[PDB]
Amino acid sequence: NFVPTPSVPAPDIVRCAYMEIVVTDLAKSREFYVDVLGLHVTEEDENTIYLRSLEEFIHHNLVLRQGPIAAVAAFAYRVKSPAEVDAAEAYYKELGCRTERRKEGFTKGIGDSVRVEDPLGFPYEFFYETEHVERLTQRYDLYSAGELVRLDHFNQVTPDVPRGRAYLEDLGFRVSEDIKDSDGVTYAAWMHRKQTVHDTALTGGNGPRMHHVAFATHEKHNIIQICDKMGALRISDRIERGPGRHGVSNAFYLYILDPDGHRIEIYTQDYYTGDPDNPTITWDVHDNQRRDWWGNPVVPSWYTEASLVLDLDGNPQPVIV
Amino acid sequence: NFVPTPSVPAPDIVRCAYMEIVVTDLAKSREFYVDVLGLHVTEEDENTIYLRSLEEFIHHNLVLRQGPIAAVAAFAYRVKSPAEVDAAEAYYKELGCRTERRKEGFTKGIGDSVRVEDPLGFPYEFFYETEHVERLTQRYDLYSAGELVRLDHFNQVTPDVPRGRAYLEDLGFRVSEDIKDSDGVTYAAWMHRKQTVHDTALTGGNGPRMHHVAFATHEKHNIIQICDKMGALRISDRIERGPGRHGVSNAFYLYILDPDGHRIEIYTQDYYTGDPDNPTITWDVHDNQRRDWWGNPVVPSWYTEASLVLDLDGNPQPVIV
Amino acid sequence: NFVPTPSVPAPDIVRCAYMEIVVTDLAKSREFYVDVLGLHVTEEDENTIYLRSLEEFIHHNLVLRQGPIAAVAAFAYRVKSPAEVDAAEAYYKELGCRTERRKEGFTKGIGDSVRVEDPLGFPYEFFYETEHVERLTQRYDLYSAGELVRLDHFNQVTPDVPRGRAYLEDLGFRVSEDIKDSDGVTYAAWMHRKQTVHDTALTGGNGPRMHHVAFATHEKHNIIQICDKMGALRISDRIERGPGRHGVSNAFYLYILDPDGHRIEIYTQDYYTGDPDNPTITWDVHDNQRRDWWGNPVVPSWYTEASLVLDLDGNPQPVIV
Amino acid sequence: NFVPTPSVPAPDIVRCAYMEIVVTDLAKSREFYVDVLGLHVTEEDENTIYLRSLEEFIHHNLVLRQGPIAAVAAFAYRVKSPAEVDAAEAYYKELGCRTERRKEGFTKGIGDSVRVEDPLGFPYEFFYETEHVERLTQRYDLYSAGELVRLDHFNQVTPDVPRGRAYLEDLGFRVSEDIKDSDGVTYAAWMHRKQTVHDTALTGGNGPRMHHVAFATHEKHNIIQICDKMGALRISDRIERGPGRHGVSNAFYLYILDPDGHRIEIYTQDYYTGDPDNPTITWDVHDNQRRDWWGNPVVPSWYTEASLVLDLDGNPQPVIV
Ligand SMILES: [Mn+2]
Ligand SMILES: [Mn+2]
Ligand SMILES: [Mn+2]
Ligand SMILES: [Mn+2]
Structure with missing residues (x-):
């Protein structure tokens, strides 16, 4: 374990x-x-x-x-x-x-x-x-x-989140928000070294895979303009999910796909997590609002597609299903 | 006819x-x-x-x-x-x-x-x-x-849009945007007397029914705040569709449902239609971007649910299916 | 007269x-x-x-x-x-x-x-x-x-505002807002044909001169970005007044100067003036808030510099002082 | 010294x-x-x-x-x-x-x-x-x-900034931005422990005095709304300076005065200063853009008025002029 x-x-x-x-x-x-x-x-x-x-x-x-x-x-x-x-x-x-x-x-x-x-x-x-x-x-x-x-965080997909969380905590990351069940088992966790919600997050799923890399904009209208420009260029089909507001992290977000399918999150609105006893926010795995504060419909590809990662020789790491 | x-x-x-x-x-x-x-x-x-x-x-x-x-x-x-x-x-x-x-x-x-x-x-x-x-x-x-x-427009559902359109043009409403097929048949039309995209619009479907009444905000962030407040109040299940950008009308929009199910549209961003030869924009019925510029998924209820309207004695008008 | x-x-x-x-x-x-x-x-x-x-x-x-x-x-x-x-x-x-x-x-x-x-x-x-x-x-x-x-309005400087107002009213412009004294004398007037606050305005002063031509942006942040870009290009000295909020017209504004000194207003936030009995808002000539809702300091050049206008032969019209 | x-x-x-x-x-x-x-x-x-x-x-x-x-x-x-x-x-x-x-x-x-x-x-x-x-x-x-x-920083007025700066660096604050002359003398410095531009800043002048305490908003439109509300309440004479963009710190800012004259800064837009070698930005004392990126006129009171501070017995500390 x-x-x-x-x-x-x-x-x-x-x-x-x-x-x-x-x-x-x-x-x-x-x-x-x-x-x-x-x-x-x-x-x-x-x-x-x-x-x-x-x-x-x-x-x-x-x-x-x-x-x-x-x-x-x-x-x-x-x-x-x-x-x-x-x-x-x-x-x-x-x-x-x-x-x-x-x-x-x-x-x-x-x-x-x-x-x-x-x-x-x-x-x-x-x-x-x-x-x-x-x-x-x-x-x-x-x-x-x-x-x-600015670049803000990475999100990784791994089969065993509790193992991943304990390993990142030993490395010094602190948990700002997590999703747990009544048993106390961690389903996902947002971890940080810097003073925003996270530098990396662990999502449960077949892995190791990269779920997304995220950049922040200054304000919400900047994210809307990205959507608008994509619609004018007729590549709105590369907009995967959003815009919406996540309950976990409180981010106003947008997920889009690059030409090879790699997922890029663009979001705005962080909150300060720098204090030593910053309260962890634990969401219940059945609370709908954790995914989307506004109830936006679920996008299945967001839970199944993610990018392969390479070993140090440059070959893909086998995905554990 | x-x-x-x-x-x-x-x-x-x-x-x-x-x-x-x-x-x-x-x-x-x-x-x-x-x-x-x-x-x-x-x-x-x-x-x-x-x-x-x-x-x-x-x-x-x-x-x-x-x-x-x-x-x-x-x-x-x-x-x-x-x-x-x-x-x-x-x-x-x-x-x-x-x-x-x-x-x-x-x-x-x-x-x-x-x-x-x-x-x-x-x-x-x-x-x-x-x-x-x-x-x-x-x-x-x-x-x-x-x-x-400000109050901006009404949207009406009626079974025969070409009949409704010609009726409203005789009343003096002009068409700012419409959706037609290759045969030139009108499927929906946005009609105006004042200098915005529309005062009323005709949607084909079982009617007569009221599809929505719409209010404008000054900026996009105002609409986002309505969503955030509804999520805080735990009534995000009353957010039916959006936020999004319609290709037709170019509105940044949000549709929400009141306690009785009446649909309210909150939107922003108009454009000027006042010139006598304001160009009508005709959208093809198969152009996906006419509904959502960002390709957001379709919401079924938006096409099936609408409000009854009353006759002058106060009794509901029967709905033609 | x-x-x-x-x-x-x-x-x-x-x-x-x-x-x-x-x-x-x-x-x-x-x-x-x-x-x-x-x-x-x-x-x-x-x-x-x-x-x-x-x-x-x-x-x-x-x-x-x-x-x-x-x-x-x-x-x-x-x-x-x-x-x-x-x-x-x-x-x-x-x-x-x-x-x-x-x-x-x-x-x-x-x-x-x-x-x-x-x-x-x-x-x-x-x-x-x-x-x-x-x-x-x-x-x-x-x-x-x-x-x-979009282009929204012109602003003209003329020595006799009451004469100018009565002449534009005969042409069909209606007054949405004006500035008057206790005597009932008009010091300036915002006049419109279209459904925004104005198509032209009359400011008292040496004339005939063009005070400014104005364009609208969709939102307030667009106007702030113009300022920011001007500062990065080191031409912030061409920003004459603003950003601010005018009490008269309720516009969030910015006035900048082109290379020859012609004044360009960029603003946002209009309100609807289309109804036949749209109430005229009369500001008292001593109400400070008419100029600037936020009390921003007066910019003297705004009251003295304005562009010459040409006669039909292309020669400047003499300015009446 | x-x-x-x-x-x-x-x-x-x-x-x-x-x-x-x-x-x-x-x-x-x-x-x-x-x-x-x-x-x-x-x-x-x-x-x-x-x-x-x-x-x-x-x-x-x-x-x-x-x-x-x-x-x-x-x-x-x-x-x-x-x-x-x-x-x-x-x-x-x-x-x-x-x-x-x-x-x-x-x-x-x-x-x-x-x-x-x-x-x-x-x-x-x-x-x-x-x-x-x-x-x-x-x-x-x-x-x-x-x-x-959120609360972001304090700003302190003191007669000898180089002494204050060295004192705060020994406490572990790092300088994100400073203003110096050709001689390399520090006139003001922005100092931080957390990852924003500053937790406190030192302004030269008669002190010890408190220049301002600052809060952040999420977006620029929030600051504009504060101004609009103060104008509606008729207390726009309590708006001292702004809205504007500071060259130093890059903040979009607003300074207002409470009933006793204490200065409150409301601003938005931070940038990340957390890296160990975050580059210090040094502004020349003669660069006008350091104060206002848009060249807004100087407001005298901003440089002369500030609040008294108390000693541990609750008595005002005498101000060194
Ligand atoms: Mn993310
Ligand atoms: Mn509508
Ligand atoms: Mn104007
Ligand atoms: Mn400050």
Whole structure:
């Protein structure tokens, strides 16, 4: 059942920082992420595109890499100092996980990093060093009507949520909201290191799979404009669920699908979770409002489709059904 | 087939002005319309409540009347001058419709009025005189987060839309948008006297029935707040459809159900239709975007449920299936 | 004092439609109106640019023409039918005003038109025919964060407001709001033909001069984004007054200056004025809130700077001080 | 010159948490803070009112206490754990500052606390324990149009900013933005413990004085509604500055004055400052955009008026001019 708790301290994680996504047609994906969504290109080449949101100063929040199979190559977290990359390496080695360290980084603009196949089969990366680039916070001359301003969280699908939760708590994540039954069993959990509702969340299901990566906008009208632009471009069929308001997290949300089917959440409205005794909100598994505060109808694909993730050799991790 | 065109001129209609609805439990309805939606009470007694929106100066936009069967007693249009009330009476008399004129009005605050059972079975009222009340436009001290600022239109369900359309064009309504097939047959039409997309619209289906009455908010966030409040009050199951953006009319919309099941549309975003040659926008019956610009899933009840309307004796008009 | 009331009927005016502005450097002005403000180019040549707002279907709302002196060449109103152009010509001829008729129009995309040097010295144009162009209402792929969606009104500066008001009332404009003193003398007036607060307004001052031309946005955040973009482009010194809320008209506003100093108002939030007995709101000349609902400080240039207007020969009208 | 750096560690501060202000007429203040601004009353008695913002779970963000002289009695910061209250006491004791520890708290709902007259003359409180109350985040049934959702920061006026800055950096606050001259001298600094731009800021001027306490709204339209409501209530002369956008901090802001003249900032739009190497943004003292991104005119009172602060005996600290 439970992942053992190492005797070495967990690495001090600051926040989720970026995700590396493999796409099958780079030009088609570039059209979606840059021309439709408006993400900012930090740099690109024939095979990879480095994108960042408006208020980011690190090198990128998303890396799109062309590959033969659409999948997620890495969920990356920034750690507090260089020594924490060492700590992350030691922690996972004690758990017996495969680890790979590259002083020069795995993606451009990132420095010394360690990638690991974690206990739940996910490719996690921990890094501290990264090139700083121009922070576009006040470049209102580049601000689009649907501007994505920051990367907020990842959502992972795994078969055993209680095992996943205890493992992430040992890593230092705290639970801001969870869904449990009368028995006290955790069905899903929102976990954070930074002061928003979450950096990652665990959803029960066949896995390991990536459910979605999420960006925030400043206000609700920005999310509506994304829908409107998609309708004008005749790609409204890529709008999967939303807009709506989730009861869990209180987020005003929208889920859309990229060309390979990877799910992107765009939401707005966070609340502060930084206090040491921030109250956990537990939702009952039968409370309808947990999914949708407004009662919007259920979208089946949202519970069944999710992206494959890769092992450190670049091959898909088998999905446990 | 087509209603005959009278030889007397049509009354000069300015805009839709109010609707009289019969509710089965006035206190339960008062809670929804006043405590939940925030409409302003002009006056009320044991059996009837007169409500108005924020920017209205005439006596009321809605009259709620207690009765044994939930239904709509009257669709009321304001005409241009006192003489037009005579015109409306003469016009319908020539069509052979039952008319009833009351110099003192049918509802409080309204003067000389004529009500008719129109050719499609709907109770229409035409009046000019009305008591003026405090226009609350700048009473920001009363402004709620989901404030309804003005009454915009009615939507009617009738079995033969081409007959209804030609009948309303003779009355002087112009078509801003319609849905037609390749054969050029009209399936639905949006018709207006004032300079917005419509004062009334015709939907094909079993009728005569009232599909909805609609109010506008100033901005999109006001509609979102109505949803959030209903979720907090635990009546999100009364949210029927939306929020969404209609392709036809371009409205950002929300449809909710009152305690008796009468459908209220709250929407925002109009466009100007006042020019004499305002282009009619014709949508193809197979274009999915005409219903939802964002492709939101269809909601069955929206196409089957609608409210009964009353004849001039106060009895429901039989529904033609 | 008063302009005589002609014995021939006034032309039936539908709304203000466009303004022809002379600029001294076309490329500099194009940068402002198109690159900064985002207006849509209908067509252009070496000497003139035809622009329209998002929801317009007539050929243009603004014509920028290069010339030696920055000034306003024409305030154009669309009339109800072709016969009304004849009516406009006859009406002004009876007043003894100079008139010039061109069956082929004075600006591209406009047909039979009559221009007149009106009694207050303004170059007014009346036309019906105009080429229709693609209405961009639902082109959300072109929608900018600060999108100007429609042309709403003109504001004119004239030395004798009571004379100007009585003359515009004879033309059929109604007063929605005015500013008067205890004596009952009109200091300024908002006048309309269409169903918003105004198509034109009269401000007392040295004239004839054009105070501003105004465009509406859908919501308040669109106006804030214009400010933000101007700050990022380092041209915030062209923001003259606002954002604020006017007590008169209830508009959330912003006034900015183009390269030649012509004033452009961008506002949002109208209210309906279409009923025949729409109550006039009279503000007292000493009520502070009439200028600014929020008490924002007075901006002196707003009361002294305004654009010159041209006579029908293209020469500036002398300003009466 | 510089405050000495103690040899004991600084207490681990999480965020600014509440301010205790003394008002001269509690009922008049209650009307402003509760009836006008809509803050939520946690509890109150004849002499004191405890208020909290929408998303707060600790007992209060503001304590209003009736007293003979309007002033600020305490700037309170929540620390990470009970042991940190001991740390704060030891730390200030080593600086030679007067401290007062109360196991039972100084205000209701707060536990073990230490208050100090800090080196710059300000009454700072550090506490960990506080009673939790219903977090109203999703009580949309209570949500007003101008809802204040969370307390964000304090702003302090002090004559020697470089001394104050170094003192706060030793306490562990990091600088997100500062204003410096060519000589590299600090004129003002924005300092934070939590992940927003600041928990407190230092403004040069006669002090010690409290410049403002700030609350955030979810969106810009909420701030606009506060202005509109104040204009409707005829207290727009209490709006001191804004709405505007600050270049420093990037906040869309509004400053208003309570009945005793204490300055409240309502703002929205934060950006994330949590990374260990978050880039400090340094603004030049001559850059006009640092104050107002839109170039709004300067408001003199903003630079001269500020609130007195009290010593631990409840007497005003003399202001150094
Ligand atoms: Mn999510
Ligand atoms: Mn409708
Ligand atoms: Mn104006
Ligand atoms: Mn501040």
